[PDB]
Amino acid sequence: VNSNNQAQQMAQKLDQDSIQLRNIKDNVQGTDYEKPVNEAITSVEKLKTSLRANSETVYDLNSIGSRVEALTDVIEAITFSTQHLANKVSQANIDMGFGITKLVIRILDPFASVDSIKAQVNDVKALEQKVLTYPDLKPTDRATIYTKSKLDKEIWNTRFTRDKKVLNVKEFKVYNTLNKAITHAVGVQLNPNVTVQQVDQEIVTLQAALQTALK
Ligand SMILES: [Cl-]
């Protein structure tokens, strides 16, 4: 039947989202997208269980498909935040994370019609372009968790190059001094009062400490 073959497409699509959403689950820790993607991962499992429970009944796959498709719009909205909203004020990610929450709720809602799901997907897309016009953070403004995402990635990038180019290559005192700057950068990341400027200088200071250990 043309319904069973269609069922394994969405089942394989839900596995693509399950892998894509667990990757995102780490990067959105402690942000406005932590609970939304946790609800999205749960939505992936309840759709799989529903598809698997009705495997050989051959029924209407319209509502189950609109929920699977809306998960791609959920993922697309999250990657849109990572690439375009890191310099925005807190309200941009707050308002947009609220919209993704409203979308995942409809995906989970058994009473949500296909129209109400598709209408909410457009709400998210319209919300994406709207938060783009939000003001950027001044260099003197307090740093948000999204501002410290670059410092967080720089700490793990310096940790990777340290264990590959410094650990067993240079003397221990070089390893010790570089580990002091990594620990110091973690203190800046954990400081709720550092500015956007102080996060930028800490990235350069840690990068300078890595080239110091690599000379
Ligand atoms: Cl912070």
Side-chain angles (χ1 to χ4, degrees):
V1 76
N2 287 348
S3 310
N4 187 61
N5 161 263
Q6 184 169 248
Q8 23 174 0
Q9 315 168 322
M10 288 166 304
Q12 289 156 16
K13 186 69 179 65
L14 288 171
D15 280 0
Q16 169 186 356
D17 304 339
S18 188
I19 293 302
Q20 199 154 355
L21 282 169
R22 59 100 157 158
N23 293 327
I24 294 178
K25 187 198 179 65
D26 308 332
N27 301 332
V28 299
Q29 261 317 111
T31 82
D32 302 290
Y33 309 93
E34 177 201 287
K35 197 79 190 73
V37 315
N38 276 353
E39 292 283 87
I41 293 171
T42 298
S43 78
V44 170
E45 226 48 51
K46 107 173 291 181
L47 293 159
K48 272 197 240 169
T49 307
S50 185
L51 278 183
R52 185 251 158 150
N54 297 288
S55 34
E56 43 190 36
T57 51
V58 185
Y59 70 116
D60 178 27
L61 293 183
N62 180 65
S63 88
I64 207 71
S66 310
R67 303 173 184 277
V68 167
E69 292 163 343
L71 279 172
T72 300
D73 295 290
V74 163
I75 300 169
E76 260 160 33
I78 298 151
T79 78
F80 173 84
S81 150
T82 305
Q83 301 171 347
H84 300 80
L85 302 186
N87 303 335
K88 292 298 180 182
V89 290
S90 302
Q91 200 58 44
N93 277 311
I94 282 182
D95 290 348
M96 219 265 288
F98 194 67
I100 305 181
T101 287
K102 264 144 71 178
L103 179 49
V104 179
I105 284 175
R106 304 267 254 263
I107 302 181
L108 290 154
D109 193 3
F111 299 143
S113 60
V114 157
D115 282 352
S116 75
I117 289 180
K118 183 54 217 180
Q120 188 50 46
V121 163
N122 295 324
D123 253 16
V124 164
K125 280 170 176 169
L127 201 57
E128 289 162 345
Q129 297 279 312
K130 173 190 172 191
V131 302
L132 278 177
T133 72
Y134 282 25
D136 291 329
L137 285 161
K138 281 177 284 290
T140 46
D141 281 335
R142 190 180 310 265
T144 67
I145 181 171
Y146 312 93
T147 312
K148 296 171 173 180
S149 182
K150 322 301 165 310
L151 163 56
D152 196 290
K153 225 61 170 60
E154 197 60 36
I155 289 175
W156 291 110
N157 279 330
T158 318
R159 276 158 176 193
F160 169 71
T161 315
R162 172 207 60 193
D163 298 332
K164 253 79 193 299
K165 259 80 183 303
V166 177
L167 176 51
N168 254 286
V169 170
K170 310 275 175 264
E171 38 186 349
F172 172 71
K173 72 198 304 282
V174 162
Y175 177 92
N176 202 354
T177 54
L178 175 54
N179 256 28
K180 287 170 184 174
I182 297 174
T183 300
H184 174 267
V186 177
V188 167
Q189 164 166 330
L190 294 162
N191 194 341
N193 299 327
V194 287
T195 56
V196 169
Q197 256 208 104
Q198 290 168 289
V199 167
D200 268 332
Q201 317 178 97
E202 192 60 37
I203 289 181
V204 152
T205 300
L206 182 62
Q207 277 180 329
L210 178 58
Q211 263 44 250
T212 289
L214 288 172
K215 74 171 293 180

